[PDB]
Amino acid sequence: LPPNAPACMERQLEAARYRSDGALLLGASSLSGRCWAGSLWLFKDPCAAPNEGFCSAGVQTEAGVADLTWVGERGILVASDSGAVELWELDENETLIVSKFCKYEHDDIVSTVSVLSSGTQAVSGSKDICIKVWDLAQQVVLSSYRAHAAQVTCVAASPHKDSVFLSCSEDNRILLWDTRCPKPASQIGCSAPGYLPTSLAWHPQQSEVFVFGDENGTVSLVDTKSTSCVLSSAVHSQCVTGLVFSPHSVPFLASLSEDCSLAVLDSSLSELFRSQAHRDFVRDATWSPLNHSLLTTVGWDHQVVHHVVP
Amino acid sequence: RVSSGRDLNCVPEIADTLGAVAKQGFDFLCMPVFHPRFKREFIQEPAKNRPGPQTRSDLLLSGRDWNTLIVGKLSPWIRPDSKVEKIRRNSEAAMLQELNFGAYLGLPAFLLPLNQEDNTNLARVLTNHIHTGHHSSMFWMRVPLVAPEDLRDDIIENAPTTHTEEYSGEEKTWMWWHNFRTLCDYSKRIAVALEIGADLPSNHVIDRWLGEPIKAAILPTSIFLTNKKGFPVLSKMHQRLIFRLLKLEVQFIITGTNHHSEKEFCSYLQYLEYLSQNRPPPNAYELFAKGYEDYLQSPLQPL
Amino acid sequence: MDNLESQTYEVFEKDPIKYSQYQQAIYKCLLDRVPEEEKDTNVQVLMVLGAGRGPLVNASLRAAKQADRRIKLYAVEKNPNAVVTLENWQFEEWGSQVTVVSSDMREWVAPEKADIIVSELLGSFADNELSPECLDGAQHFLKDDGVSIPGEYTSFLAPISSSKLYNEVRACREKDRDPEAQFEMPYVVRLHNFHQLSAPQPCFTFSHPNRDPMIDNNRYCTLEFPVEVNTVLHGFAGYFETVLYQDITLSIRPETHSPGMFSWFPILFPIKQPITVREGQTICVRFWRCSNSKKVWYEWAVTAPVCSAIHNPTGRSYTIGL
Amino acid sequence: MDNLESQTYEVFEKDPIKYSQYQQAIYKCLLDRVPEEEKDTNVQVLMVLGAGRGPLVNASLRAAKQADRRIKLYAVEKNPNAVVTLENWQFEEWGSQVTVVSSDMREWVAPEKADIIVSELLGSFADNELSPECLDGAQHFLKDDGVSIPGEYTSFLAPISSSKLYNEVRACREKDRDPEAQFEMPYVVRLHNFHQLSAPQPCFTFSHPNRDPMIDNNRYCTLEFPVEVNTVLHGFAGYFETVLYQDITLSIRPETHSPGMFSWFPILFPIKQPITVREGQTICVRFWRCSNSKKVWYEWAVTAPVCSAIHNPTGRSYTIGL
Numbered sequence A: 001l002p003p004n005a006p007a008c009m010e011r012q013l014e015a016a017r018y019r020s021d022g023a024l025l026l027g028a029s030s031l032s033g034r035c036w037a038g039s040l041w042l043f044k045d046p047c048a049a050p051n052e053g054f055c056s057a058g059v060q061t062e063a064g065v066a067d068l069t070w071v072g073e074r075g076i077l078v079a080s081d082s083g084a085v086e087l088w089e090l091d092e093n094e095t096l097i098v099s100k101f102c103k104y105e106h107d108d109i110v111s112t113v114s115v116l117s118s119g120t121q122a123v124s125g126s127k128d129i130c131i132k133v134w135d136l137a138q139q140v141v142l143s144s145y146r147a148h149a150a151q152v153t154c155v156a157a158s159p160h161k162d163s164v165f166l167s168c169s170e171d172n173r174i175l176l177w178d179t180r181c182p183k184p185a186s187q188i189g190c191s192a193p194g195y196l197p198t199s200l201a202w203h204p205q206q207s208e209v210f211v212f213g214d215e216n217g218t219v220s221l222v223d224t225k226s227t228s229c230v231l232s233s234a235v236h237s238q239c240v241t242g243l244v245f246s247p248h249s250v251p252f253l254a255s256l257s258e259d260c261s262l263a264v265l266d267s268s269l270s271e272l273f274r275s276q277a278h279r280d281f282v283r284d285a286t287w288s289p290l291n292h293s294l295l296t297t298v299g300w301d302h303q304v305v306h307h308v309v310p
Numbered sequence B: 001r002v003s004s005g006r007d008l009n010c011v012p013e014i015a016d017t018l019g020a021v022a023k024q025g026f027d028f029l030c031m032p033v034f035h036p037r038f039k040r041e042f043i044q045e046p047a048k049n050r051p052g053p054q055t056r057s058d059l060l061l062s063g064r065d066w067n068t069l070i071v072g073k074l075s076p077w078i079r080p081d082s083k084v085e086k087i088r089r090n091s092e093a094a095m096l097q098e099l100n101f102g103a104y105l106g107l108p109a110f111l112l113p114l115n116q117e118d119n120t121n122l123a124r125v126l127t128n129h130i131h132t133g134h135h136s137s138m139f140w141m142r143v144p145l146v147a148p149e150d151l152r153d154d155i156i157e158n159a160p161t162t163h164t165e166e167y168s169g170e171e172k173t174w175m176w177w178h179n180f181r182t183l184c185d186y187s188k189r190i191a192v193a194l195e196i197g198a199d200l201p202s203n204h205v206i207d208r209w210l211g212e213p214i215k216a217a218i219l220p221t222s223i224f225l226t227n228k229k230g231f232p233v234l235s236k237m238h239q240r241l242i243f244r245l246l247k248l249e250v251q252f253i254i255t256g257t258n259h260h261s262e263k264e265f266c267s268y269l270q271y272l273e274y275l276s277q278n279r280p281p282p283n284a285y286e287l288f289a290k291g292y293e294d295y296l297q298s299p300l301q302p303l
Numbered sequence C, D: 001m002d003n004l005e006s007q008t009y010e011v012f013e014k015d016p017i018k019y020s021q022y023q024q025a026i027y028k029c030l031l032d033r034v035p036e037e038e039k040d041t042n043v044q045v046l047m048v049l050g051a052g053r054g055p056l057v058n059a060s061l062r063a064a065k066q067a068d069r070r071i072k073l074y075a076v077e078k079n080p081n082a083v084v085t086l087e088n089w090q091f092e093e094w095g096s097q098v099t100v101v102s103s104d105m106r107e108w109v110a111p112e113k114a115d116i117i118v119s120e121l122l123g124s125f126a127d128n129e130l131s132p133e134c135l136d137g138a139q140h141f142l143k144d145d146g147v148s149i150p151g152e153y154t155s156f157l158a159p160i161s162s163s164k165l166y167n168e169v170r171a172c173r174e175k176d177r178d179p180e181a182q183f184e185m186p187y188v189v190r191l192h193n194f195h196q197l198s199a200p201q202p203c204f205t206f207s208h209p210n211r212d213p214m215i216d217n218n219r220y221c222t223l224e225f226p227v228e229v230n231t232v233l234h235g236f237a238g239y240f241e242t243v244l245y246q247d248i249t250l251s252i253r254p255e256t257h258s259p260g261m262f263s264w265f266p267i268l269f270p271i272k273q274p275i276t277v278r279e280g281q282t283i284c285v286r287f288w289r290c291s292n293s294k295k296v297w298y299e300w301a302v303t304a305p306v307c308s309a310i311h312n313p314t315g316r317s318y319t320i321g322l
């Protein structure tokens, strides 16, 4: 174990993100027992995870980590239980992790963050029903939006536009945002209101399409232009917590669920793969940048699993 | 003076947090009894068999501290009235579990939201818990003066907020509570934790709540304005309401983060204690009648 | 948890349609399971579960000689007093084609699996006699392709006006118990001086055998009754329907009542306080079926046009023993 | 059927003598089962049955390091709230020497048989908390030569005079139940203003494990109390004794009370009507221990010098849930 690194890693793995160089970023919370905290980890050897002794870097955060994201190659943006959005900076040697800012701006658990396309701004979502736009350089909230009427579940930045992002709430709304508009949000989704939306991912190329997952295990594909739901599949038997597109030319979609399974789907939402490797909730997925058929999932079982995808 | 508590939805170490808030001036803390994100599963394998501990240990506080300093909070993922059957079932079981733990701990109070119209099943579960042993402890329903849906920003192009006249609609929230409490057969154990917002609704909506069992009033940091010297204070209107609530001797609860950054959390509190010390002293009748408020007597019959 | 009296079996054995209908159900089922070329070689194992004094055993025997097919019979009955009648039937008449078993169907360790179980464990609200729990604890001895007769049952509710019945319930206050307990239990009653406020709607449904990986018999259901006169709600009539086999059914739901069948009267779920409903309004009611390892009970509430108290929270006023 | 509160475990964990006595019982038993030459090679499997917050697990651990012998521990507890405390103890302290099991001991399918089960499931009248039924349903996972601690317990009764307590019972009438129900249930009470009319006599006795081919926990016993003053009988004090292991015992029977042990107060069995007894007369009483698959209860009557009504016929006023 490196200097500054904790001797032990929090049981509940929340997040897993490959940097472009191929190294693994892990976020983890302690959701039970005496101390309810969280930690951040960097693994230059991804196959060594989750063992704390074979990490490149590691650090304790005050509260749990509800969501994570890379800023650039050295920045780590954190959604905390504490109400805080925090930015952690990576070391020069990349052997320690250092708090750059901790802002107590949300009134409840911050549950979701996404980095906007430029890399200079981010949007966060909270149980406090707010959605906030951050200046990362300035360490301030530029815009604060109460669009929703129940806690916010997911916020996703568009692949290429700094002012466009999706959000979804327990108030049954999926909102397409565009901060260029006087009234920024616009309500989108299928004809009939359905089951609550629980996860969102933009298509990395067709910059006008996204998938969304609901609390009933259904993954659905939406077009913003034709403003209606095209395809849908019953993928999972429990709520869909994450959706991750592969880096591939025509991309695959990883689907992860509280049913403890991973699934991988093609463009038409047909099932190519499924993994029961996990024995608790599956919280994240990342595709190796180095090996485009390699996929990593983490769970609340403390497994870091590397899947080989056909 | 004023009995007041802190509402937190994040507690990394209970010992420390309780110390922090006590130092800050608070009489009690409202906090999760399970980690708010710690969604449990009760039927389907393998998550069902998730090794324990399911939460943090009772040994962490004295019996007395549990009895007097802590108010439980239902986990916010527990949705007994969801339209999805599997969520409804886990939620029933989860609610029982957290309810049973509060009782196991001996908590004096325990918070549950009414944050939508239909809480039939929440009511059914609570009523059941109520009739499973006879206990003293209170259930505070956390209801807002104004419903979230009627408080949102007018910022959806294709779903505008309706600016027309809605006498009945602006009372929707009272009906949420009315119905819940009717279903639960007016149990003396179920009281109101009234949530106050930046925008007070019409005065009539504050009329509704007049005779209701309000045991606590929740003040988000969000609603405080700032004076010249940067201290937190409240609009004239909000003061009027506080004064009404002081007369009813509710407990006050501060929720949310500190937004007046150059001040301690104790400054919000200091303002409240300022307001109560600055209320007109009770007249001679009010001193005599003091111990007797809503105490029912037989009329005297000296014949 | 109680044992039925001799005269209670007597009155109900007198039903024309109930048993004729079971005969026809057993008849069809045999034909579908043993082809003509197998008629003499295939002996179907038939189990009557809760056989009372035997009419279902006789109706099984008549079904097999009508199908011209061969059957072995087991007659399981837990009421040892009825087991007297059965055992005297099997010595005097049935001979060893029928094995009389005196035990609970949830307990009986069966010497072999069955082709078909036959049961009549149904109350006026279908499942209110615990037919689900009984058959669930038996099904482990039904063959993988086995048939349960009945295969299915469904309960129904309709709101009613009747101040007469309201008053009859109210008059059921007893000493030494909750003064409002009368109102938190269902009554079998031949509804007569009443007004039915809306068409019956399906409530709870059970299927047998139960192929659920996890079997759960608890239920929550929400019914919306469009009402188009002014009136006062005093309670809910319950009825039921069941699929014995295929198209052969039994019903006490008025729209599809089995003609001549007198074996079940309607059931009444009262409410503590009359509720005024206006023309054009919806009555919303909510029913739960609840359980312990010891007991099963219903809880109900009206949530529109106005709310009531939740009735029977916890089975405090009425449960059915397991 | 209920779950004990945190503060209830707290008060009772404070007993000096109860746990020290269990430590000593586990201590001796280990020595008798693993000889010095086996000390490092023989690891005894120990099961604490109803482990509450763990003091018996700690007392097991202290007994093994005092015996210098090796043990594997299972901590079975059905109160999931206490299972919280246990699971936090086993992560923070015990490590994997202790396997915490959250289930009912009658249900738990054990991965292996035990050398010794340890339990404290005893009420002021020994078996009135259903220690027999609990341990009976567990013993199938005790090895053939296995030891139960406790090995044995015995209840005792003595007749008492006390108009104070008679009056305290009478004052326990509640609305909505039998007006005399107060009198048909036993009270844990620190008997203070009372007169004990005769020496306690043994009542019911249980042994563990139970080597009976047919296990029956029901009992009928008849006690004759020679009385030598005039007075009025108002009830029966109960007490108990138990053999933890060999000579190591616990007792609340006054003649042999364990010094300093405050964990059990005496129990009171009232009677509906005071009965006058004269010097020289015998008080005859009769106690039954009764059961269902659902509940266990006592019924009692005085038959001399005059008769009383049979108390609690059927468990109509009080039962203990299974």
Ligand SMILES: O=C(COc1cccc2cccnc12)NC[C@@H](O)CN1CCc2ccccc2C1
Binding pocket: C004, C008, C009, C011, C012, C013, C052, C122, C123, C124, C188, C263, C264, C265, C266
């Ligand atoms: O619908 C009714 C009618 O009740 C009665 C109606 C008329 C006379 C009765 C005499 C004794 C008992 N119940 C009577 N009872 C509930 C329902 O379980 C009826 N079933 C009908 C089928 C049946 C068969 C054998 C033994 C008992 C029964 C009871």
Ligand SMILES: O=C(COc1cccc2cccnc12)NC[C@@H](O)CN1CCc2ccccc2C1
Binding pocket: D004, D008, D009, D011, D012, D013, D052, D122, D123, D124, D188, D263, D264, D265, D266
């Ligand atoms: O003899 C008594 C004394 O009762 C009490 C006496 C004094 C305070 C009490 C507080 C809470 C509950 N009971 C109390 N009770 C019956 C008997 O079962 C006591 N045992 C004693 C051992 C024990 C250990 C752990 C948890 C509970 C118990 C209860």
Ligand SMILES: C[S@@+](CC[C@H](N)C(=O)[O-])C[C@H]1O[C@@H](n2cnc3c(N)ncnc32)[C@H](O)[C@@H]1O
Binding pocket: C003, C004, C009, C012, C013, C049, C050, C051, C052, C053, C054, C055, C056, C076, C077, C078, C079, C082, C103, C104, C105, C106, C119, C120, C121, C122, C134
């Ligand atoms: C309503 S009766 C019908 C009797 C008979 N089949 C008839 O139609 O006349 C149901 C019978 O099932 C018996 N029974 C109910 N539950 C049972 C169980 N779990 N095991 C065995 N018998 C049962 C009852 O004692 C009763 O005689």
Ligand SMILES: C[S@@+](CC[C@H](N)C(=O)[O-])C[C@H]1O[C@@H](n2cnc3c(N)ncnc32)[C@H](O)[C@@H]1O
Binding pocket: D003, D004, D009, D012, D013, D049, D050, D051, D052, D053, D054, D055, D056, D076, D077, D078, D079, D082, D103, D104, D105, D106, D119, D120, D121, D122, D134
């Ligand atoms: C009186 S307490 C003693 C607790 C602990 N041994 C002590 O001395 O502090 C009995 C404990 O056994 C548990 N228990 C009772 N019956 C049980 C059963 N059948 N299976 C598992 N646990 C049981 C109770 O919940 C309770 O915590």
